[PDB]
Amino acid sequence: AVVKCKPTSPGRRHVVKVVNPELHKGKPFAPLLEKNSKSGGRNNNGRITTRHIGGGHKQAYRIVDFKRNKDGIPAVVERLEYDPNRSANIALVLYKDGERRYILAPKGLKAGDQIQSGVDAAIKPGNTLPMRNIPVGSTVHNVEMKPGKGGQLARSAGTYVQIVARDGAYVTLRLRSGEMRKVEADCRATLGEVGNAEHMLRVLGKAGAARWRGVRPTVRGTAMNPVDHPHGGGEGRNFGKHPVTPWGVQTKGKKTRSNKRTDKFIVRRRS
Amino acid sequence: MKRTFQPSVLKRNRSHGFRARMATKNGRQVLARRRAKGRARLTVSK
Amino acid sequence: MIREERLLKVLRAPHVSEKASTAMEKSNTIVLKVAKDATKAEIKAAVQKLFEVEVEVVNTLVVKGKVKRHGQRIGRRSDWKKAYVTLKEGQNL
RNA sequence: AGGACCGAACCGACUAAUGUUGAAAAAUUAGCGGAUGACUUGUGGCUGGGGGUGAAAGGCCAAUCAAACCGGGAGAUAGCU
RNA sequence: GCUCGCCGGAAGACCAAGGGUUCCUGUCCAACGUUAAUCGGGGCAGGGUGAGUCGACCCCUAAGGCGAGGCCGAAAGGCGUAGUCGAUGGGAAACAGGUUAAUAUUCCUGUACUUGGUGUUACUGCGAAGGGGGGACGGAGAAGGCUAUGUUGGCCGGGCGACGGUUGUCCCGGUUUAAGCGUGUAGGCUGGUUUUCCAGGCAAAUCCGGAAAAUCAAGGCUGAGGCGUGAUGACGAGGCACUACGGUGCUGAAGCAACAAAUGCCCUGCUUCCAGGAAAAGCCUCUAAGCAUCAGGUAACAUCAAAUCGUACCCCAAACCGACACAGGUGGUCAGGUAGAGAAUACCAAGGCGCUUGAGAGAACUCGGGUGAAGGAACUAGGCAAAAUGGUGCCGUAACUUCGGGAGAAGGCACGCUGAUAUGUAGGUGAGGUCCCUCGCGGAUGGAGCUGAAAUCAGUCGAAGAUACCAGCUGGCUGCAACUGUUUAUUAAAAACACAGCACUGUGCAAACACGAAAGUGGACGUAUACGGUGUGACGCCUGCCCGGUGCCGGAAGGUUAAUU
Ligand SMILES: [Mg+2]
Ligand SMILES: [Mg+2]
Ligand SMILES: [Mg+2]
Ligand SMILES: [Mg+2]
Ligand SMILES: [Mg+2]
Ligand SMILES: [Mg+2]
Ligand SMILES: [Mg+2]
Ligand SMILES: [Mg+2]
Ligand SMILES: [Mg+2]
Ligand SMILES: [Mg+2]
Ligand SMILES: [Mg+2]
Ligand SMILES: [Mg+2]
Ligand SMILES: [Mg+2]
Ligand SMILES: [Mg+2]
Ligand SMILES: [Mg+2]
Ligand SMILES: [Mg+2]
Ligand SMILES: [Mg+2]
Ligand SMILES: [Mg+2]
Ligand SMILES: [Mg+2]
Ligand SMILES: [Mg+2]
Ligand SMILES: [Mg+2]
Ligand SMILES: [Mg+2]
Ligand SMILES: [Mg+2]
Ligand SMILES: [Mg+2]
Ligand SMILES: [Mg+2]
Ligand SMILES: [Mg+2]
Ligand SMILES: [Mg+2]
Ligand SMILES: [Mg+2]
Ligand SMILES: [Mg+2]
Ligand SMILES: [Mg+2]
Ligand SMILES: [Mg+2]
Ligand SMILES: [Mg+2]
Ligand SMILES: [Mg+2]
Ligand SMILES: [Mg+2]
Ligand SMILES: [Mg+2]
Ligand SMILES: [Mg+2]
Ligand SMILES: [Mg+2]
Ligand SMILES: [Mg+2]
Ligand SMILES: [Mg+2]
Ligand SMILES: [Mg+2]
Ligand SMILES: [Mg+2]
Ligand SMILES: [Mg+2]
Ligand SMILES: [Mg+2]
Ligand SMILES: [Mg+2]
Ligand SMILES: [Mg+2]
Ligand SMILES: [Mg+2]
Ligand SMILES: [Mg+2]
Ligand SMILES: [Mg+2]
Ligand SMILES: [Mg+2]
Ligand SMILES: [Mg+2]
Ligand SMILES: [Mg+2]
Ligand SMILES: [Mg+2]
Ligand SMILES: [Mg+2]
Ligand SMILES: [Mg+2]
């Protein structure tokens, strides 16, 4: 539930937060945790290859089951938990043989629900099936691209994919971005949409909130000198140039996709 | 006012010590040059 | 076991000083200059065999040489080891 | 509760006087700003010169920066003094 | 040596870094010390640093480094797997008293503790490179219980006062005691136990996880402090006697209680929030190969071992970084009294200092301060500077507003001391005694003693009672930037940068993009509610017309058009 903060200070006036009473309040499940140290946008050369990354709160990685390959053994949801590593929430499920797993929390799931994966799983939110066994027109998430590889599409909060057609060894998906794409019918998908659809309604409110999430400030190209940006220079505010990246490529409309290997799987572009 | 030299023996040895110079071939060329000049103190090591 | 050669090499000299004298007269401790690489056990065994006393325990420290001056020349004396070794209150070597 | 308020430590540096062969190659004195945060600080580590880093002043990269320092081409060239 | 002055959240004491003999003793005064020097961090010579428990080394890992093979690269090399290193973090153990000119948790006295190896014994399933538990972790906030520590009383020793008084409700001083061991408390957390079964834990498992019965309804873990002991000990004001008047030997009373109380401990707890908060080993537990009247494991006892290196001294400084015995800089710890909210501030305690040129004089002028008749911004670019305000409680407080603010708006009143209320009150603490229960660090009752605000009324002194130090000037109109932040280290702090928010655009994942001849790596162990680029810059009302020029996007009938042939 979204909540508007009260303007008791200038930094709180515009804060809109997402508050979920069902998220677990205790510590996460330790055996499914591991460290993940921060990079600051630096590669193995030590150089900044992606700007504006650094700082933020320490985080532990949660090993989430994207493969959903433990077929035919029902599992029970034990709780919903906060995940700092992604926008969606995750659910701790307990299988009937005693094994516990994290899965992405779909919409409408709560403690006590039963999920199941496999060819013979029922058509219910949270159940994983190969898309050959999912009715045309269904809404799915955590969609595989290669069979057995793991879910890679429609993973962020509130996302989902529509199965528009099924002809032969391939199905046609309408991706969240809006392009039509083909994928092998043996690729698995989870029924329903990702939960936490109110995530996009949050308003950070202040600069420090964005600093908490490891984002460093962005300096405008027009505000610097010509020696370090094509937009730089000028006596007063001057532009007189076609907008470009810090490396001189046009940055308003020029297309950058060049992949003829995968062009065959793209039925229609997002537009 | 804080001046430029802030001594740390461990950092000195790791930056300029005998084993640091021997690590790379350019450091070994540094050692060879200083041997050819006849330097009494080859490195900062001691 | 330590050979006779090592035990014969590990004792250098008796240290003589006012603190050494008071240790002699107050704690039945003798103060010795010993080999730089000499261990506590080697010193104990050497004192027991080459002086024929019973040794309670040996305490050791390393003395640093002083940087001296011999007419504008920068010299440095050598480090050396000193052993405080006490006897079993019945020997008085 | 709070990039909340007043205010020491701590971090900073708005005004004035002094000092300007200084006590000091940037300080002192009286005031001044922040002071649970985009805070501050210790230890260690990583990024290297047309390169790095930069909440961007062409700022900083060992009192050196519109291209560091050391050595070399090198006795560069100098219709100039 | 007697006075005087200064610091005392330091200008005292102690760790780490850094330095390296500057430490102590004797001797000397050339040079060094901004003067003299008999003095010195100066010269010269000698002396001085004692560890199973402190630290390093050691075991373990972070960031990161290196890296057998490997992948890549004209060469040089680059990256990286298995591995191996790398603390600023995890891992066993000691305290008190005494002692040197110079060391001490290291020496001595007393009293403890940890780990390992051997030998004898009683038994006994042991075994890892594997599994599981544990170690193991954020911010803020709140109270309770304590302790360090202080105050006062009691007690012990001493005193009866240079000038009026001083046998008392008088004055000075002391009234200290560890680790360990035993007790398991204020408090926190968790339901135990026994069976049976099971697609999980790379194989196995009696261990973990899961499921179902029965049974008890309590078992366990954690835990400051207190009490006992350690301790009839040590320490102890003082007092006897030498002395080299530097010090010494010896003896030694009281050694209790109440109150107050930490930012330290319980507490790695509890409550709450979102930004969701290391790793590995030590440790416990389970088995695999394997071994089997042996090796091995547990308990007991005895014996042995615990090496090596550091340890002086400075350490907010004359010994470190600043060329200097330089108004600079330098991480952590300790934290007394009175007044005070306080680690502010004033005066002090312990403790440490008077800053390595002095002596006169009492011109101009410069520096840093005090006071000023009448006027009161007339000064000046400008109230620059100075002057002024300044506390607590209570009363009261406008436009505007995003309803939080504006606001400490503005403005005003009281404020010392004495007595009474009330031989000391409201409150806090709390003894004895009385009663009871699974008798204990228990409960209940009970109120002695102790400590103790604030207020009201009456009186009273001064020019003045927030009397010193300390400690907002206030209001009105307007430009700019929403705001907290950031910046030209060393002439610019701003209206500049950033910002939350907005929009455009790219990007389907081996993503775009970026560093890379490459291998790879970041983006991201993220997947379009995501990520990169660009411009704008909270919020409110909004954001009109032009595609001729240039750029970008789409198209391909035609014209022109490379290599090649
Ligand atoms: Mg960005
Ligand atoms: Mg932005
Ligand atoms: Mg500029
Ligand atoms: Mg350019
Ligand atoms: Mg202009
Ligand atoms: Mg123009
Ligand atoms: Mg040098
Ligand atoms: Mg030693
Ligand atoms: Mg604030
Ligand atoms: Mg303040
Ligand atoms: Mg600054
Ligand atoms: Mg100042
Ligand atoms: Mg403020
Ligand atoms: Mg400029
Ligand atoms: Mg510079
Ligand atoms: Mg150039
Ligand atoms: Mg030439
Ligand atoms: Mg020339
Ligand atoms: Mg000397
Ligand atoms: Mg001295
Ligand atoms: Mg002189
Ligand atoms: Mg000397
Ligand atoms: Mg000993
Ligand atoms: Mg490598
Ligand atoms: Mg190799
Ligand atoms: Mg290691
Ligand atoms: Mg490594
Ligand atoms: Mg460490
Ligand atoms: Mg000393
Ligand atoms: Mg007490
Ligand atoms: Mg605090
Ligand atoms: Mg010492
Ligand atoms: Mg100084
Ligand atoms: Mg001086
Ligand atoms: Mg500092
Ligand atoms: Mg003070
Ligand atoms: Mg005068
Ligand atoms: Mg004057
Ligand atoms: Mg005046
Ligand atoms: Mg007067
Ligand atoms: Mg006047
Ligand atoms: Mg007047
Ligand atoms: Mg007037
Ligand atoms: Mg005027
Ligand atoms: Mg005028
Ligand atoms: Mg002023
Ligand atoms: Mg004033
Ligand atoms: Mg104007
Ligand atoms: Mg502003
Ligand atoms: Mg500001
Ligand atoms: Mg400047
Ligand atoms: Mg300035
Ligand atoms: Mg990739
Ligand atoms: Mg702008």
Curated annotation (Swiss-Prot), chain A:
Part of the 50S ribosomal subunit. Forms a bridge to the 30S subunit in the 70S ribosome, contacting the 16S rRNA. Interacts weakly with S6 in one of the 3.5 A resolved structures. In pull-down experiments interacts with CedA. It comes from the Bacteria. The keyword DNA-binding does not apply. The modification N6-acetyllysine is found at K241. One of its GO terms (biological process) is negative regulation of DNA-templated DNA replication initiation. NCBIfam families: rplB_bact. This protein can be partially replaced in vivo by its H.marismortui (HmaL2) or human (L8, from the 60S cytoplasmic ribosome) homolog. Residues 38-47 have a biased composition (Low complexity). InterPro entries: NA-bd_OB-fold, Rib_uL2_dom2, Ribosomal_uL2, Ribosomal_uL2_bac/org-type, Ribosomal_uL2_C, Ribosomal_uL2_CS, Ribosomal_uL2_dom3, Ribosomal_uL2_RNA-bd_dom. Pfam families: Ribosomal_L2 (PF00181), Ribosomal_L2_C (PF03947). Coiled coil: none annotated. One of the primary rRNA binding proteins. Located near the base of the L1 stalk, it is probably also mobile. Required for association of the 30S and 50S subunits to form the 70S ribosome, for tRNA binding and peptide bond formation. It has been suggested to have peptidyltransferase activity; this is highly controversial. SUPFAM superfamilies: Nucleic acid-binding proteins (SSF50249), Translation proteins SH3-like domain (SSF50104). Residues 27-52, 220-271 are annotated as: Disordered. This is Large ribosomal subunit protein uL2. Keywords: Acetylation, Ribonucleoprotein, Ribosomal protein, RNA-binding, rRNA-binding. One of its GO terms (molecular function) is RNA binding. Belongs to the universal ribosomal protein uL2 family. The keyword RNA-binding applies. The lineage of its organism: Bacteria, Pseudomonadati, Pseudomonadota, Gammaproteobacteria, Enterobacterales. The gene is rplB. GO terms for cellular component: cytoplasm; cytosol; cytosolic large ribosomal subunit; DnaA-L2 complex. Signal peptide: none annotated.
UniProtKB/Swiss-Prot annotation, chain B:
Keywords: Ribonucleoprotein, Ribosomal protein. One of its GO terms (biological process) is cytoplasmic translation. The keyword GTP-binding does not apply. One of its GO terms (molecular function) is structural constituent of ribosome. The keyword Cytoplasm does not apply. It comes from the Bacteria. One of its GO terms (cellular component) is cytosolic large ribosomal subunit. PROSITE patterns: RIBOSOMAL_L34. Belongs to the bacterial ribosomal protein bL34 family. Part of the 50S ribosomal subunit. This is Large ribosomal subunit protein bL34. It comes from Escherichia coli (strain K12). The lineage of its organism: Bacteria, Pseudomonadati, Pseudomonadota, Gammaproteobacteria, Enterobacterales. The gene is rpmH.
UniProtKB/Swiss-Prot annotation, chain C:
The keyword Ribonucleoprotein applies. InterPro entries: Nucleotide-bd_a/b_plait_sf (IPR012677), Ribosomal_uL23-like (IPR013025), Ribosomal_uL23/eL15/eS24_sf (IPR012678), Ribosomal_uL23_CS (IPR001014). One of the early assembly proteins, it binds 23S rRNA; is essential for growth. One of the proteins that surround the polypeptide exit tunnel on the outside of the subunit. Acts as the docking site for trigger factor for Ffh binding to the ribosome (SRP54) and to nascent polypeptide chains. Belongs to the universal ribosomal protein uL23 family. Changing E52K: No effect on trigger factor binding. Part of the 50S ribosomal subunit. Contacts protein L29 and trigger factor. Might also contact SecE and probably does contact SecG and SecY when the SecYEG translocation complex is docked with the ribosome. PANTHER family: 60S RIBOSOMAL PROTEIN L23A. Coiled coil: none annotated. The keyword RNA-binding applies. The gene is rplW. This is Large ribosomal subunit protein uL23. GO terms for cellular component: cytoplasm; cytosolic large ribosomal subunit. GO terms for molecular function: rRNA binding; structural constituent of ribosome. One of its GO terms (biological process) is ribosomal large subunit assembly. Keywords: Ribonucleoprotein, Ribosomal protein, RNA-binding, rRNA-binding.
